[PDB]
């Protein structure tokens, strides 16, 4: 038999049909505009469903990301807190399958691939999401179920994602060249964009409630982890004890999860695939570098001229920079 999804699918897909329509960053794949941001028209199916079908319950704990600003890392640290009674860190899950099988999408896993494991046991209380803060399921809000959200520098972000899409099977065509990608970037026009809107909604949220948001930035905890992996650790209910914190319990935790060690690992190597449904990326293609400031072999200044001013009228006087 047919899953929810599958039996929604043909409504859903009329029901977008005759939203707003714009060019996306490939020429078979437009974006389209749903509640003040741009989606593919996939993961637009997917968030819809997720909006009608979604139940989120309050012991619930959800990522929440804008794409390439640290998600892959994030699912990894919250996976290997959350469980670390369970396992020695030789046996640790996260050395045998990609971070992304152990906690689903809202909006894809859910609709899509609905018979993975994680997502049949009610034990699972780890979700994952990009879909903007005012598009959250109802149940999402309503459950009062945690949250944390990561950004990420924009320039960083952009070539994050503009150099992971040439890695997408896809029959929908090459990407769009630098220029037109980062203009399209800049104007918003991207998925789940605009970026910066993204964000500044997430950022309203948590200054209206700081208890039930937790707020990470990747260049933060990428040069000082250790702070942000107790932070993290104690809000989502597992913090780590003192005698923990004593037997070097978080440096582990820290360097599990570490790009380094992920990368390396065989099942994230070269073209292997996740393992738990179909992707349309090898588990290598969320490795890349890991690093902050990899815009400058990408962008000249005038690009990075562009954005820069484009966050500081956004983002002046919020506290975001502040
Ligand atoms: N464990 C990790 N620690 C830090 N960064 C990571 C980790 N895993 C993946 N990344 C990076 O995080 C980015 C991917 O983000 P998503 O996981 O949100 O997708 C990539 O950055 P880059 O393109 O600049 O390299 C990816 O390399
Ligand atoms: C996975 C969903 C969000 C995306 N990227 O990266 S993420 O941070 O891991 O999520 S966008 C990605 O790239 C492609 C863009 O053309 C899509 O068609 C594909 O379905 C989509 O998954």
Same mark, same amino acid.
């Given at each position: 038999?047919?899953?929810?999804? %599958?039996?929604?699918?043909?409504?859903?897909?009329?029901?977008?049909?005759?939203?707003?329509?714009?060019?996306?960053? #490939? &020429?078979?794949?437009?974006?389209?505009?749903?509640?003040?941001?741009?989606?593919?028209?996939?993961?637009?199916?997917?968030?819809?469903?997720?909006?009608?079908?979604?139940?989120?319950?309050?012991?619930?704990?959800?990522?929440?990301?804008?794409?390439?600003?640290?998600?892959?890392?994030?699912?990894?640290?919250?996976?290997?807190?959350?469980? #670390?009674? !369970?396992?020695?860190?030789?046996?640790?899950?996260? /050395?045998?399958?990609?971070?992304?099988?152990?906690?689903?999408?809202? @909006?894809?896993?859910?609709?899509? +691939?609905? @018979?993975?494991?994680?997502? *049949?046991?009610?034990?699972?209380?780890?979700?994952?999401?990009?879909?903007?803060?005012?598009?959250?399921? $109802?149940?999402?809000?309503?459950?009062?179920?945690?949250?944390?959200?990561?950004?990420?520098?924009?320039?960083?972000?952009?070539?994050?994602?503009?150099?992971?899409?040439?890695?997408?099977?896809?029959?929908?065509?090459?990407?769009?060249?630098?220029?037109?990608?980062?203009?399209?970037?800049?104007? =918003? /026009?991207?998925?789940?964009?605009?970026? /910066?809107?993204?964000?500044?909604?997430?950022?309203?949220?948590?200054?209206?409630?700081?208890?039930?948001?937790?707020?990470?930035?990747?260049?933060?905890?990428?040069? $000082? &982890?250790?702070?942000?992996?107790?932070?993290?650790?104690? +809000?989502?209910?597992? =913090?780590?004890?003192?005698?923990?914190?004593?037997?070097?319990?978080? %440096?582990?935790?820290?360097?599990?999860?570490? +790009?380094?060690?992920?990368?390396?690992?065989?099942?994230?190597?070269? %073209? *292997?695939? !996740?393992? $738990?449904?179909?992707?349309?990326?090898?588990?290598?293609?969320?490795?890349?570098?890991?690093?902050? =400031?990899?815009?400058?072999?990408?962008?000249?200044?005038?690009?990075?001229?562009?954005?820069?001013?484009?966050? %500081?009228? *956004? +983002?002046?006087?919020?506290?975001? /920079? @502040?």
């Amino acid at each position: 038999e047919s899953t929810e999804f %599958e039996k929604n699918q043909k409504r859903y897909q009329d029901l977008i049909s005759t939203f707003p329509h714009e060019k996306g960053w #490939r &020429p078979k794949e437009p974006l389209i505009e749903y509640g003040g941001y741009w989606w593919l028209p996939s993961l637009l199916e997917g968030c819809i469903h997720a909006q009608e079908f979604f139940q989120a319950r309050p012991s619930d704990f959800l990522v929440c990301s804008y794409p390439k600003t640290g998600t892959t890392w994030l699912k990894a640290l919250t996976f290997a807190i959350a469980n #670390r009674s !369970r396992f020695d860190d030789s046996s640790n899950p996260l /050395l045998k399958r990609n971070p992304h099988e152990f906690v689903p999408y809202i @909006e894809i896993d859910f609709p899509f +691939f609905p @018979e993975v494991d994680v997502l *049949k046991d009610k034990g699972n209380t780890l979700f994952s999401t990009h879909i903007p803060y005012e598009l959250l399921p $109802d149940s999402v809000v309503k459950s009062g179920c945690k949250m944390v959200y990561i950004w990420r520098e924009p320039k960083d972000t952009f070539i994050s994602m503009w150099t992971f899409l040439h890695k997408e099977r896809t029959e929908l065509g090459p990407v769009s060249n630098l220029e037109e990608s980062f203009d399209m970037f800049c104007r =918003g /026009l991207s998925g789940y964009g605009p970026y /910066l809107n993204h964000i500044l909604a997430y950022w309203k949220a948590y200054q209206e409630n700081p208890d039930r948001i937790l707020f990470l930035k990747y260049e933060t905890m990428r040069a $000082d &982890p250790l702070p942000y992996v107790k932070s993290l650790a104690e +809000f989502m209910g597992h =913090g780590f004890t003192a005698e923990e914190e004593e037997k070097g319990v978080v %440096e582990k935790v820290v360097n599990l999860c570490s +790009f380094e060690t992920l990368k390396n690992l065989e099942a994230n190597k070269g %073209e *292997k695939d !996740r393992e $738990d449904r179909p992707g349309v990326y090898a588990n290598s293609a969320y490795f890349r570098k890991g690093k902050v =400031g990899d815009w400058s072999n990408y962008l000249t200044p005038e690009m990075a001229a562009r954005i820069d001013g484009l966050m %500081e009228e *956004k +983002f002046k006087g919020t506290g975001l /920079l @502040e």
